[PDB]
């Protein structure tokens, strides 16, 4: 949105870059930050940890009723069965979409997000536009921003991550997928479907 007071994006980037390099130089001199530490963190969340992990959890729940029960009982412990867990998903609570209930998750106070199953959040999740509106007008927001119409008779539950409990949505399994393999099913599972802003992919 227009702000006549705001510098260009290019000027903002130039200034941030200098500030960050300056701070970086000082933390390096203190011996608490190194180039390898930086590269390792980046590599993990660029290449290793991402929503393909949550997808594996989802499709196991879809194809294994006992695992699904365990997942809903204790998200952290269930995900550890798949070697999935860790930073900012130490405490996971999965919630199940049904014909009667739709779940959507938010961190209104900041940006909290279940990194071990979804990786780092997309910028829109962290930004004030989504965070402000989704607790107040979720039905309208889902329709207008995501093209996702939840009938008024269906309950929408919005989960605001104010604690270290991390909420993850188990989307409903799309129709027409009877007997599909876990690999085939995983193609239907999106980051968005595990946030609750979209259903899993149809067809």
């Amino acid at each position: 949105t227009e702000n006549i007071l705001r510098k260009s994006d290019e000027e903002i980037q130039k200034e941030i870059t200098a500030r960050v390099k300056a701070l970086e130089s000082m933390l390096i001199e203190q011996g608490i930050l190194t180039t390898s530490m930086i590269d390792r963190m980046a590599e993990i969340y660029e290449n290793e940890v991402g929503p393909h992990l949550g997808a594996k959890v989802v499709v196991k729940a879809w194809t294994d009723p006992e695992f699904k029960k365990r997942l809903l009982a204790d998200g952290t412990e269930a995900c550890k069965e798949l070697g999935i867990g860790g930073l900012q998903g130490e405490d996971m609570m999965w919630v199940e979409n049904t014909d009667e209930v739709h779940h959507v998750v938010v961190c209104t106070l900041c940006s909290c997000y279940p990194w071990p199953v979804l990786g780092l959040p997309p910028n829109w999740f962290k930004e004030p536009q989504y965070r402000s509106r989704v607790v107040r007008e979720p039905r309208q927001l889902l329709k207008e921003e995501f093209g996702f119409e939840v009938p008024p008779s269906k309950e929408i539950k919005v989960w605001d991550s104010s604690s270290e409990m991390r909420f993850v949505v188990l989307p409903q399994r799309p129709a027409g997928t009877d007997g599909w393999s876990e690999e085939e099913l995983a193609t239907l599972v999106t980051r968005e479907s595990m946030i609750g802003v979209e259903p899993a992919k149809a067809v």
């Binding site: 949105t1 963190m41 867990g85 930073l87 536009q129 979720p138």
Partner: protein, 228 residues
């Protein structure tokens, strides 16, 4: 505190900006900002709750429109200055230096295996905030409770939109680090944690969505009993 960061329920912030796709890191400075979190955490700049509180103290106009990882930079500097680990005047001088000399090298330094080990352990092992306490939980599933109207200036997880609102206890989780102490440098002082369900009409008034609720996590001191 009652900061602008507490945006739940705020109107007029504009349409969602959602590019069809986007990289994890949009610029090299973002990678650096991100990796600075375990670095400053290990070095004792701040814990997680304190980290959040630093961001909450930003210039609100800057908060609302700056790139996300800039928030992280602000809180590192805030806590660096707070703890005396960062000299502001030196930081300002170095900022001007890298303004004028953007391709100047970073300081010579040794790599440290222990920092890689820290990263790996933190990422895959986590930093769990769950704690054992001696007191039993005060509340249980089904309890109807009311959220505190307290308005601390210091850090808390008390979104304005739920203050004074009633709600039904949905799940007790166990005890966790308490933000109102931890974020203010007063220690973990753990408290039992509950998810509480608030109807949309309770939150937003008589015209609210009759078929929507918001689930919000409440530490024990945040809530007091209405109907058991």
């Amino acid at each position: 505190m009652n900061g602008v960061y507490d945006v739940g329920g705020t109107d007029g912030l504009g349409p969602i900006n959602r590019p069809a796709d986007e990289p994890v890191f949009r610029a090299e400075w973002e990678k650096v900002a991100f990796a600075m979190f375990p670095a400053t955490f290990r070095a004792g700049f701040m814990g997680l709750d304190e980290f959040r509180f630093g961001i909450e103290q930003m210039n609100p106009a800057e908060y609302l429109e700056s790139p996300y990882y800039w928030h992280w930079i602000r809180t590192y500097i805030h806590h660096g200055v707070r703890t005396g680990k960062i000299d502001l005047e030196e930081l300002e001088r170095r900022t001007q230096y890298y303004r004028e000399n953007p391709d100047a090298p970073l300081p010579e330094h040794e790599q440290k295996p222990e920092l890689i080990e820290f990263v790996n352990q933190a990422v895959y092992g986590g930093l769990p905030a769950s704690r054992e306490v001696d007191r039993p939980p005060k509340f249980k599933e089904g309890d109807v409770v009311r959220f505190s109207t307290a308005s601390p200036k210091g850090h808390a997880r008390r979104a304005r939109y739920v203050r004074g609102k009633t709600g039904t206890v949905v799940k007790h989780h166990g005890a966790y680090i308490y933000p109102d102490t931890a974020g203010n440098g007063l220690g973990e002082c753990p408290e039992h944690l509950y998810t509480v369900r608030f109807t949309a009409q309770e939150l937003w008034g008589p015209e609210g969505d009759p078929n929507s609720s918001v689930y919000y996590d409440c530490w024990e001191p945040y809530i007091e009993l209405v109907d058991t």
